[PDB]
Amino acid sequence: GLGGLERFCSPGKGRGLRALQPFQVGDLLFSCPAYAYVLTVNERGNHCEYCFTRKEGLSKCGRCKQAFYCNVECQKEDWPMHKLECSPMVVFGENWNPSETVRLTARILAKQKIHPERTPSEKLLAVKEFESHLDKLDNEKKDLIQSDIAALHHFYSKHLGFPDNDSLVVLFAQVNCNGATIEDEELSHLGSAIFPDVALMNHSCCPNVIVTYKGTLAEVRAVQEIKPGEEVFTSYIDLLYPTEDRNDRLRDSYFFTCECQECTTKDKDKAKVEIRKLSDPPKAEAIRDMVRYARNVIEEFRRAKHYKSPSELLEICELSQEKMSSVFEDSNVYMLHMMYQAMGVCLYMQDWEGALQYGQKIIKPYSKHYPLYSLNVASMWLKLGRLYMGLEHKAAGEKALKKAIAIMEVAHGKDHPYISEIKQEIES
Ligand SMILES: Nc1ncnc2c1ncn2[C@@H]1O[C@H](CSCC[C@H](N)C(=O)O)[C@@H](O)[C@H]1O
Ligand SMILES: [Zn+2]
Ligand SMILES: [Zn+2]
Ligand SMILES: [Zn+2]
């Protein structure tokens, strides 16, 4: 398996990963090549399909004209997977729209068909041993999975010999509980992948490691000191939100309730739900009313941004901030949430000054709500630094970039290509 590590049975968590030797903050616990992976549609042309390297002047697949490569070698290496989509993409035309989960599952089945034996990605845990939580799925969940299976048959029937329906349901549930989004240095979505050895790690809201990505390779580095015998815990979710929100998401997606220190004590929750200390104290029921409102408007915005204009979205953020502010301080995570969304739609609108203005009032609370080494914090420092540099505020830009580097050296490793790029952006 992996030196200095050991698969074991973690009480109340099923199987987990334990350390057999000490690891210091920044040490590399291990690296894991992707078992199967797929680049998200919106990043085609920016990244190489095979190795995920970002560069300009990628070779275009002459066949489908929708898959870009470093060279003919990367193209050849990606052909066993790319042929699943090359011709269907041109035949279906505009009707080709499988969800990313379907694309990934199709590549999983292909990888099992050609490489049925244990891969180097499965040193400690094989794909077939994945947890499915089949018995927990309600009818709504089952019907969503059945819709994905229907799409799988619809777009990938010519190249894959499919197992029976039951097995496909198990596979999709396993993907939903073990899949891994790949994000860039600004936590922008690059694609989805299966990292069997990485999936073994259980969740904690105070994790001791962070998973970063070097192309299609997952790397796992410590963000706290790990001693022999201690279990290795990563985070599955955004840690910004209070305990009940986190466990709502964990129950919904992974079907378990977390009992880590943050969940048991809920101490940071008080900072996260900051109430204005005004002459008139809000009553508890008014607080809970505004909290419910906040959680509702967050979901409403997730929906609205698919069919609404950017300015309409900014209006939603501005109006919700005013209403919520009557009760919530600006450091409240629901205010920060709407500020972050406003920053994103301003970034899309290319209003760099506006987005910078929002980002400035986001990093101060962000830094304290998130753990010491957090990719969310690093990415915010990086976005800020790049806006500063773009608007020629070099002094403040360099400051922000160094803060990002300080966290990334730990999480990504000091020799990571991203850090080289950022140091170039300081010297240029
Ligand atoms: N902190 C935690 N408490 C209880 N169960 C957890 C947990 N973190 C992860 N899990 C379990 O692990 C699943 C994710 S895959 C992680 C490995 C899994 N424990 C296994 O034996 O294969 C979750 O769906 C949940 O069932
Ligand atoms: Zn490449
Ligand atoms: Zn093609
Ligand atoms: Zn927790």
Author numbering: 5 to 432
Give the article text:
L351A/W356A is a secondary-binding-site mutation that targets both subsites M and L, while F184A targets the target lysine access channel at the active site. The F184A mutant was also crystallized with the PARP1 peptide, but no peptide is found in either the substrate binding site or the secondary binding site, suggesting that this mutation also disrupts binding at both sites. Phe184, together with the two other aromatic residues Tyr240 and Tyr258, forms the target lysine access channel. Mutating Phe184 to the smaller alanine (F184A) widens this channel significantly. In the wild-type structure, the target lysine fits snugly within the channel. The mutation likely disrupts this precise fit, leading to the loss of binding. Despite no peptide being identified, the secondary binding site contains PEG-like electron densities.
Here, we present the discovery of a promiscuous allosteric site in SMYD2, a unique member of the protein lysine methyltransferase family characterized by the co-presence of the SET and MYND domains. SMYD2 is a critical regulator of numerous cellular processes, methylating both histone and non-histone proteins to control chromatin remodeling, DNA damage response, cell cycle progression, cell differentiation, cell survival, and inflammation. We have determined four crystal structures of SMYD2, including a wild-type protein structure in complex with a PARP1 peptide, a wild-type protein structure in complex with an ethylene glycol polymer (PEG), and two structures of SMYD2 mutants.
